[PDB]
């Protein structure tokens with residue numbers, strides 16, 4: 382028992398982090414087989430970053446302009462290219478610690494772990510959600526770019542995020558590992574704002590099931606609701622609509638606890654309309670929306686990697 | 687910017703986890719150089735655990751009764767002994783992934799990361815505090831015993847916790863790596879309860895400094911207070927007394943932000959007496975007490991390992 386925000390073990394990703402320096406700009410890179418992936422703005426000077434022409438900046442660079450360090454070892458760059466907002470540096474050494482991996486593009490509402498790095502070295506690991514407005518609520522400082530987000534499935538690391546920028550509101554934006562941004566953002570230092578965020582309803586419901594599994598049951602009420610009537614209420618409180626697909630992914634938790642999904646929706650509806658009256662759920666006074674249904678099942682059943 | 691509950695990168699500890707099986711009981715072990723450390727109740731059957739005589743149970747065991755698996759490799763046990771509540775199994779192979787390490791005993795209020803494991807394999811990592819009542823608010827299931835807690839300082843892993851039991855209230859208790867329990871607990875399945883917990887005042891203050899650093903400043907008031915007058919108020923709200931030692935460890939944050947420690951205490955005192963009026967600090971509606979001053983400085987300055 383107990384329920385914690387839990388990150389994936391980071392070791393498989395730690396063995397892939399390197400430092401990439403171009404000129405005086407140093408950022409983090411991801412070394413998989415004989416390729417280093419990193420954010421393209423490693424080739425920018427401070428003055429270049431307001432309206433960079435990355436293609437032009439890259440034309441002026443040769444392989445040897447990129448200093449790649451893996452621990453105390455310099456990796457020799459033997460090729461380079463740009464794919465959207467990522468640079469790919471081919472090196473003459475394959476990473477012996479490369480895990481089984483794939484590159485995925487995740488959807489809003491899905492969670493992942495971030496290994497925050499500086500100078501190619503890990504600082505810490507935490508769990509995040511891709512928000513419905515395509516931001517993440519991270520913790521990143523200057524030099525963190527190239528830090529990656531990932532999930533693990535048994536032995537396979539699915540990389541889904543590479544960090545690029547911070548928005549004025551303290552939230553973070555980045556790309557998939559093919560260098561395509563999540564959301565309507567561009568890697569230049571110009572005025573950019575995220576759209577209004579919304580609460581990830583299916584994840585709140587998952588967390589209420591986690592609460593039931595841990596014996597925190599006070600919020601269960603005696604009612605049911607229709608999916609339509611629930612969604613009318615959720616809409617007013619800036620909750621995402623609950624779809625049948627969401628209902629289906631809640632199926633395992635619903636079967637395990639014997640609480641129908643639409644019955645949990647009735648209990649959530651009451652929490653939204655009436656509040657919590659100074660009570661907590663799993664120790665929180667606010668409803669939590671950064672656990673997916675899969676996260677809850679994994680944590681409550683002890684799934685390992 | 688941004689502030690998250692952050693765990694240490696777990697890879698150094700992942701490379702030390704193994705599975706230990708004795709009879710039909712399987713738990714996790716920590717393999718450092720040529721020694722595996724694990725909880726002694728691996729030698730218990732289900733019936734033994736209500737009033738085990740561990741010395742007697744261990745007399746009947748030979749080296750070969752302990753099956754140690756590191757991945758797909760069986761490690762040959764060549765010696766065994768018991769030190770308080772930990773077994774030490776000498777193996778004929780040194781762990782090639784052993785990090786630089788030490789065993790420490792931490793104090794209440796200090797934080798650490800937990801790598802939760804089952805069958806010798808990692809499930810996830812999260813950050814915890816040793817509570818003032820010597821419990822931790824973890825997430826652990828049957829089979830998690832032998833999972834460890836740790837801090838990292840540059841290249842050195844300080845192991846401070848090994849998991850043994852869950853109390854009826856959903857909280858967790860365990861030992862240091864010399865097998866001595868934190869708190870007045872014993873490893874037998876009998877009625878045991880933790881004392882009343884208390885809020886870790888110096889950590890709340892650290893987190894309010896984190897909030898200021900991130901621009902969440904609304905709670906700063908115009909007043910100061912004496913240490914004595916603060917502690918009278920804290921006492922009523924079940925906050926630990928703030929000592930001069932605590933004031934001193936808050937020094938770096940105080941110097942960085944230019945807010946005197948006793949001035950932050952005046953602001954905390956107002957929050958305790960008046961509440962938060964539906965406002966949040968760093969997104970939380972409750973005051974957070976599981977960041978130490980060192981955690982805040984590390985996260986806000988980008989310290990790496």
Ligand SMILES: *C(=N)[C@H](C[C@@H]1CCNC1=O)NC(=O)[C@@H]1[C@@H]2[C@H](CN1C(=O)[C@@H](NC(=O)C(F)(F)F)C(C)(C)C)C2(C)C
Pocket residue numbers: 408422425430521522523524525526545546547548549553567568569570571572573687
């Ligand atoms: C790379 N390490 C940093 C990481 C940022 C810095 C503070 N926290 C982070 O996560 N990335 C940048 O500095 C990028 C980089 C130039 C400007 N920039 C920004 O993050 C800026 N943001 C924006 O311009 C905005 F709002 F549009 F997103 C900054 C104002 C410095 C936070 C490039 C090329 C975009």
Ligand SMILES: *C(=N)[C@H](C[C@@H]1CCNC1=O)NC(=O)[C@@H]1[C@@H]2[C@H](CN1C(=O)[C@@H](NC(=O)C(F)(F)F)C(C)(C)C)C2(C)C
Pocket residue numbers: 382713727730735826827828829830831850851852853854858872873874875876877878
């Ligand atoms: C080892 N893997 C488990 C971990 C527990 C099980 C559920 N969550 C956990 O963290 N350890 C145990 O099962 C230990 C083990 C026998 C009994 N036990 C307990 O944790 C029990 N608790 C207590 O007896 C209490 F309250 F005294 F702490 C249990 C009731 C099963 C949770 C031994 C030898 C103590």
